[PDB]
Point group: C3
Chain length 477, copies 3
């Protein structure tokens, strides 16, 4: 009972040097929450279990947050979440300790009309890529279906939503052509005409009159509508709309001959999102908000893989909104947000690239990370990352204090860089922003890899950030 509670804290927050348990919780998390909707829902439920109070965006917060502050979260669009801890003794000059990550991952979306005519008896579905999917890595993979259904119960005018998930059933697969056929079997393949998921081969019930009353009748195969309705526990007639993903249902696993690796889908950026959220929860356990003088948050964004210019992406400003609304409700007096942000540190936590020993020519000597060491700073002099000399120094100081190791990633001068939310958050807030993350192999694959210790090592680092960033940043004044 009491020993199990101590052992639980030790596993989740790596207090007894137990990295294996947190690695498995991450794997289970990825497997049980295939879509962005599931991930945000998982964290929402996690936050409820650790006494964070949900606040709706749709209502003013002046009545919900008082002088004692506390632990809160809000959700936008079901895909964009911000959790935060506000201290009774917080002032504008203390700033905010932020970790910003994204919860969207490369996937395949069902088209608004997924219906395709049968092709020599084969059932197929019309889909679209979200980011750079539907390539050769997506061929011959077991694909489940899941996401958000919108429904309206009979004899009501309420539109409600349900999350669905076929796991472990792979409902479809994108079949490669056998190499025996020659040149037609050689990639790359047309994302509209060639990489189409095969969902069935049915044999010889037709649609009922009630099923035909569904808004989605004609838009999707009657078998599909029946299936998702059964998963949701509603009638076909009640289905209003849907937003469904196809995703790899292969469960993650520890691997390598010495178990040094973790293989799993959708690491970018659910890896950092998970580690940052668990760190927040671990940190929150020992925070009395009545005595604290800090403002801490993890904010999770959608649509980072498509450039962040949506209301649920980093450019939509959920962070800025949360800090403005909370501080207004907290003090009930004029808060200078420019002073707030000038004293803040934002960690833009996004996965970066582990050294791949089979492609040494793309990695910059002395500026790549390796597995199971620690967090990696993303450095770039051309604005792809927001990291600057003070932020580098802050993180290195933090790590030396907390016993963490820090690695570097920067591109070769003849190479090219990805871009993160970091520059966007820095510009929108005016606050010093540091791009960093847990490094991984095979980013944007359907199944990626990181170190087996790296989930725990990330949790450890981010926990130390929340504990010590304010004290460390004060050295620079």
């Amino acid at each position: 009972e009491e020993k199990e509670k101590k052992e639980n804290e030790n596993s989740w927050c790596i207090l007894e040097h137990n990295y294996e348990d947190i690695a498995q919780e991450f794997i289970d998390f990825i497997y049980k929450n295939p879509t962005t909707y599931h991930v945000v829902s998982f964290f929402a439920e996690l936050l409820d279990k650790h006494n964070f109070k949900y606040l709706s965006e749709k209502s003013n917060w002046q009545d919900s947050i008082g002088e004692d502050g506390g632990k809160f979260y809000t959700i936008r669009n079901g895909t964009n979440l911000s959790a935060f801890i506000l201290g009774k003794n917080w002032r504008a000059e203390k700033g905010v300790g932020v970790i910003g990550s994204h919860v969207d991952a490369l996937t395949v979306k069902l088209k608004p009309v997924s219906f395709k005519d049968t092709a020599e008896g084969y059932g197929r579905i019309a889909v679209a890529p979200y980011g750079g999917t539907l390539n050769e890595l997506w061929l011959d993979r077991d694909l489940g279906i899941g996401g958000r259904l919108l429904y309206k119960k009979k004899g009501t005018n309420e539109i409600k939503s349900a999350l669905v998930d076929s796991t472990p059933l792979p409902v479809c697969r994108i079949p490669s052509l056998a190499p025996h056929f020659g040149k037609p079997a050689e990639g790359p393949f047309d994302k509209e005409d060639q990489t189409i998921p095969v969902i069935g081969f049915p044999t010889p019930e037709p649609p009922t009159d009630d099923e035909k009353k569904s808004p989605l009748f004609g838009k999707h195969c009657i078998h599909l509508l029946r299936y998702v309705a059964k998963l949701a526990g509603v009638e076909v007639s009640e289905l209003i709309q849907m937003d469904l993903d196809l995703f790899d249902v292969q469960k993650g696993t520890i691997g390598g001959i010495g178990k040094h690796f973790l293989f799993a889908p959708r690491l970018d950026d659910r890896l950092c999102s998970f580690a940052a959220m668990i760190a927040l929860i671990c940190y929150a356990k020992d925070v009395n908000t009545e005595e604290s003088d800090l403002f801490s948050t993890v904010t999770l964004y959608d649509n980072e893989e498509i450039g962040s210019l949506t209301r649920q992406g980093a450019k939509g400003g959920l962070l800025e909104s949360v800090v403005e609304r909370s501080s207004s409700a907290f003090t009930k007096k004029p808060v200078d947000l420019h002073t707030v942000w000038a004293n803040s540190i934002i960690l833009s936590a996004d996965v970066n690239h582990l050294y791949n020993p089979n492609f040494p020519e793309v990695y910059l000597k002395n500026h790549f990370p390796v597995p199971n060491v620690g967090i990696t700073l993303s450095l770039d002099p051309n604005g792809h990352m927001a990291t600057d000399v003070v932020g580098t120094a802050l993180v290195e100081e933090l790590a030396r204090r907390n016993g963490d190791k820090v690695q570097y990633f920067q591109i070769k001068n003849n190479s090219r860089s990805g871009g993160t939310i970091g520059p966007s958050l820095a510009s929108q807030t005016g606050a010093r922003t540091i791009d960093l993350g847990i490094a991984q192999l095979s980013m944007h694959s359907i199944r990626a890899a990181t170190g087996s210790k790296d989930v725990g090592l990330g949790v450890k680092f981010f926990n130390g950030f929340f504990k010590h960033w304010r004290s460390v940043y004060d050295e620079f004044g």
Copy 2:
């Protein structure tokens, strides 16, 4: 009787789609530049009892507890009209239609002067967006836009709009195919697609005309002409912002009159439909009794990416809502709560199925003429439309008796972007990309359905009436 007949034609109350189609054609023809379009809507708003508010003055003394019907203009090319009900509160949100009034055109260069070329007069021009291609060759081009002038013996700089219509002052002449390879396009936009304005025979500049700041920057024939159109002296002209545009008047067409052919549909088609819908809706709205905040905001510079003060990224919508709500309550307004409860229709024209290019249209995701409004859907952020917005629009249409169509690109194709994503992130409000579909977007002369203007007006009117009620189903 006359007022009942006008309401039927303009607001499609008696099922009359012909008249509103003709008014749209007349509107496009009579207002060739963005300046003219904004001026048209300003005059229209004045006639329906909307009060102009200047951006340069604080609105607290102009808007009170009763709210009302208002509009404002930035740069002469960015206009926001709004209806603020006396019983509005932050949790009601705002119902917004955002469209753009800029269209592909050709601009006179700051110095339009060119030396005569074997006797031919020509003017130096620049493309605004993807113009000066083969579709702009051999078209009758009028000249028009904004002149800035200063009356002689005064210091004030004033504005006049000018328009040569029906006179086409110039034409970009194709080379006869007889000459062979030189006559094959594409053509150089600087050296080959140059408007020919005249061929003058053997008065030189007077001493007064030389006092013009524009003397030497434009041909004296041109300066005299635009001076005459504005009713000012050449000496008084300080600057100008002039377009060249197709003066071919729009028309109903097709063997069964199913089509409307007209220039500059992108996006004056949705802008007109949304604005007429707002005026129709406003006729039956008592602002003393209303609990809603409704707006149509019209932007400039969308075709060049919206990053100007008069484009979507310049934030006129957000400013209007902030200034209105501060003046209205005279107390702190939670603008985050306002936008969280809002719906933005990003109304921009999308693509009708072209039966001659079936390979670029996505099966089950193309619109056809004369059916209804088309949702623009995109999973990679080119459009702001999401699952809830789709369901909302479909719910709204089922209630109002409208039809809804889909547009989405093929996976192996390419998509343009709209202001929708910009508005969504700037406000944090759910934004829905949709519009009236058309053929031949970005041509000098495009086409849509002859009923689509009226169908568009009907849908947007339905939006203003029922969006709040329908969106409450999702809460």
Copy 3:
């Protein structure tokens, strides 16, 4: 006193002194850090009070207004003068420029193994550097060191500069070797700075030196060198952000001394000219009497797209005006009214006519040396300049006795973009892109007219004196 004012502020037609001060400024302040520090020291000497971003400005700015400046990141500076009689309807008179220039940055780990005895350092390009123009140039090293004195927990900053010593040179391969000596060259493997060729008798690292966080990240000779320049121990070094730059001092040139040759003109030329205009202007402003709000805001990261906290998109201008106006009045300020009445000059260098490349310059739309400020015009959103802005600057010039030139690209050419569109969009204010024209933009060593620095200062000084009065004629 009068001789100093006449030299700096060009009051007795002395253009050579200010040109030489500019050359000295460029030579003594090679990095963005030095440039901001130079302007900070200049502002201090002219009685502008420094305000930290990290504290509320309520206790530093009162109803009297005054002369102030603030700094973000050591590279983003905003200086401003706020009049006691200022109100929202007077707006703000803004010059916005950038102080970052194309350079070469040391990598976070600059260490390289010796290569047949040669010492080299690992570096990266900031903008389009490490090309053939960067070969065979004498390169100095300088920038910001972070250190922590022994027995303290205080991270402090020091600026270092090797000038006149060129520590580095990127050596071209001799043409004798043939094809390998033909560019372009790989920026990672071929354009690597050579820093030395050490001999055995450069001592081994001491135990204290090994305690540095930077031990292993840079070779010990480099660490010892930068420690000696800052006056600290190697062990105390925490981090560094260092540039490589041309140490060739600028000069007046041409057979008639019509030119000025110097490195890093983009955009320290306009920044210097704008800042000196502000100080010259500020000498005769009594803030107790003034009703104006004036600012020069200097940005970092313009050359890489401005999307950082210290770039234009980070909003230091907007922040300055909001914080100032809040502390100034303590009765709420309508910022939308403020910006609606404002003028922003986006002052960034544009392109002088290069007579060797006539084919890329647009006839009647290029500037020449020693005439005056050049308006940057573009109808596709690369610049923010509009017809009213053009007329304002021309009016202003006519009143102050300045000359104005034009720059616009040919229809078949390509344009760069400035911060102008960003600033116009973020504020909603009318923004005018203009600048002092130069040859050879983005070279390691560029050129402008020898009179153009003074002509720039004179024009910008005229702007601060007269912009409010002139813009009132357009109302």
